[PDB]
Design a protein around this ligand. Sequence first.
Ligand code: ACP
Ligand code: CA
Ligand code: CA
Ligand code: CA
Ligand code: K
Length: 994
Amino acid sequence: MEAAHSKSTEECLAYFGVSETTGLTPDQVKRHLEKYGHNELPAEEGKSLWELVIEQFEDLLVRILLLAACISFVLAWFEEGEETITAFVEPFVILLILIANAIVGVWQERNAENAIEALKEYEPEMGKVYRADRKSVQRIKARDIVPGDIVEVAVGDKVPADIRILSIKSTTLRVDQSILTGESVSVIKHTEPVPDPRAVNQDKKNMLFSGTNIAAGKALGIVATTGVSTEIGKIRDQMAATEQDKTPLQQKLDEFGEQLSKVISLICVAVWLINIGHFNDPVHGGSWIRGAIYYFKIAVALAVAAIPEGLPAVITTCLALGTRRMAKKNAIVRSLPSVETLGCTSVICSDKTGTLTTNQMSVCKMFIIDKVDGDFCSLNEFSITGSTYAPEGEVLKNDKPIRSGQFDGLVELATICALCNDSSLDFNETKGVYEKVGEATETALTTLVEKMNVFNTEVRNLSKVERANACNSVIRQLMKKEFTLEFSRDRKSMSVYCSPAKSSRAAVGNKMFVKGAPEGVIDRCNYVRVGTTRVPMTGPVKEKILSVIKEWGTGRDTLRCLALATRDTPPKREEMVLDDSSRFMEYETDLTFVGVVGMLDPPRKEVMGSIQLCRDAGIRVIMITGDNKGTAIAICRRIGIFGENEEVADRAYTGREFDDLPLAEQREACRRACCFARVEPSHKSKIVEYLQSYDEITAMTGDGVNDAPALKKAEIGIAMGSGTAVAKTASEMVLADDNFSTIVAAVEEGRAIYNNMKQFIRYLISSNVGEVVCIFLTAALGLPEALIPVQLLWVNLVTDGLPATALGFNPPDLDIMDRPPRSPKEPLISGWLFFRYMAIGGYVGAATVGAAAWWFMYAEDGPGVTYHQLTHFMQCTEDHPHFEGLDCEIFEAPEPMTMALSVLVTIEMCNALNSLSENQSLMRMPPWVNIWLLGSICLSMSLHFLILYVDPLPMIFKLKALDLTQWLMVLKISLPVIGLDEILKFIARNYLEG
Ligand SMILES: Nc1ncnc2c1ncn2[C@@H]1O[C@H](COP(=O)(O)OP(=O)(O)CP(=O)(O)O)[C@@H](O)[C@H]1O
Ligand SMILES: [Ca+2]
Ligand SMILES: [Ca+2]
Ligand SMILES: [Ca+2]
Ligand SMILES: [K+]
């Protein structure tokens, strides 16, 4: 722990007693680990509080029923009902259905968080450190980083710990500190001490803070603090209310829930108004307001039934369920609305290098100039064995292993690859594998130098650790790297200014070693090196070099190519200003061509299959890369974006070609082109921007810092697990698996969510409407009451609870990935879907009423009398109108209220079976595709059988179970409602794109 950023670079090194270039010894690391602990915060085991998870009572709908149960609890405490126990069942029934959905909701939120945190720990954060047991930089777990050791940081790296800057290898260092200071744009760092000890974080310009990202440059530093002493560690739980808001779909349903409230409220008030006639009816005797209290109970109870109380929980469930499914496929969701938005995605933008490709780079081909004689130019081509970063391979010429030192051109080629390089190799002992340190492109050159061994260095007797950078270290001991002009994606090249290491025997020449994009580098070459000789760049020589480059990139291997050049006579250092990066290209002119390297970069296996699935799902895929167009087009053909011979004359554009187009043509090009090569980070963001101008949901996939602007711009940013931290920071999803196939699954899963949310709405509306229609159909036709305040709360608990919620666990539709992406601005309920809600709601209302009437009109146990209660409901006892009223008490009979109560339950469990798919029949999608639903149906049916035969309960819910013959009628009328929907589903199936 060093608490001072005011100390100099020497004082920091002296404090921990560590050598700047060597790092902490193994014994030092041991002590510092005991004294300062592991560089790990606990992560806080209390991610959530059990009860805090339980608070699912925030939604308006839960609050309504919450209050609704209260009024029935107040109406049960004092008067307002004679038999109190039955009135004490009312609020407990309402509480019962809420807790059921609450348990379900709490459960899924619990499973999600657990699965999320488990997936987050799969890949241990690694850091680059110099330590005494190794000459080259090595990679260790970030938690094993202790205060005092030398840590190396590069572009795209997450800063592993609080670090005092010792040396900036680049000409500048920019850092993204938004996670700590809120500074939107990157800030510049230096090495000079900031004298003030109490200085705020924004002024610590000689410090790197853990959790921040290196925007540009490369630096060497020493850890000041780790663990909880780290600046970002103190503030993680320090401030609250920084959490996420509700998703677009969730906001869409919130709107929907309130509109339902206004309708149901109107209806409930309307139910109260239409029944102000039975004000003074003998049921409550002669009552001026007591008669209203009962119908106020009816209105309130009808609300609770009609209100989709399960809706708030089923959204959170479907979301948490989707996340958990994604978690199983090693996909990390950093932003909740990522899955629902991806479901309605029409265009997927994807980076090529590292994203569409495995980023396991290995130079397998390279050439230098052989002979130059007029219009004649011949090249010395070479092949390199080894597809890994391992320093094991051969340099083949004419299918013969050769010594690269034999060719002077290869000597300088290897020199450039070694010096003009900000990467290295580190052997990981754990299951022994050579790992890259930095960018894969540069490491492929590092392993090349090792394979070439141009100075015949004895490497046989070296360990696998030393061997990783054996030949590279030899070259570095021959030329002192003064400074480095960093790789810039505008000039697309990189150079290093070097002087002879001896500096005593040799002072003959300073050199600039340049590598970069072939086209750019070659253009800035005026000379061509032939061994140790140098000749002027001409037409024929230029054409020869370029044509071979075109061959490799278009070939069956599709080689990523780099040109390597040298400035024989560079400007004196005084004439060079390292301040502006725009003048670096000027410094990299009058170069001497040395050679061209060719890299193998295999596409990921699952990409080709995934693209076809995207094409079938109406999702378009565009490749966006800074690489050569020839190789980009060739890869596009290799992965299926383009056919093998599509001849895509107007479907592929370079950054130059794209800019030469007017704004209108650029915007239109993004519609037709599926391949953008040689483009800058700004182009990637602009392409996504154009696609969104057509009101499209655009997704972006990348791994580098050149994808960062486009990742933040797109609807959904998806990062690679092996990618940079800058890209992950700018993303909504992270694929730790590096599995591109998960994206297609993520799209599919999000559409199941929407469709399941649809079927949930389709079930509850079309069923609860039928409940409402029933109440209206009886009160208007002048029939006895079908239901009672208690009975109303029962058909709610049974039909609007778990059988409703279980629809959230519905399987994806059969043609879910054969239909086009849903437009984001589609109406939640289509104009025609609303007709189903009535067509089903109409029959349910007519089924529940016909049941209570059939007891009155055709039941043998009942009176069995013909039409319409002998035309009126007036009768009650003898001596009223003598219209053959042989029957005495055939009114206020509890058996038909049953009959309605039982049809209502049965017909909704019946209706729920239609909510397995939007338009697919029960034939193609049988009931056993959802076991969770059938269990809820059985539970609801069993709960209804229980409430009817357990003798004290019939007294409460008023039910003499006319068991055999009448349940048949209940089952009989409830059955066509699934038959009708089956016919109703067949219509829209065939009506719209049959
Ligand atoms: N370290 C490096 N030094 C010099 N040139 C480099 C380099 N890394 C890449 N280049 C070259 O610069 C070109 C443009 O760089 P850029 O980073 O924008 O594209 P890219 O192909 O490497 C990333 P992607 O394909 O993921 O978008 C590359 O095509 C490559 O030829
Ligand atoms: Ca309800
Ligand atoms: Ca990349
Ligand atoms: Ca219902
Ligand atoms: K974004």
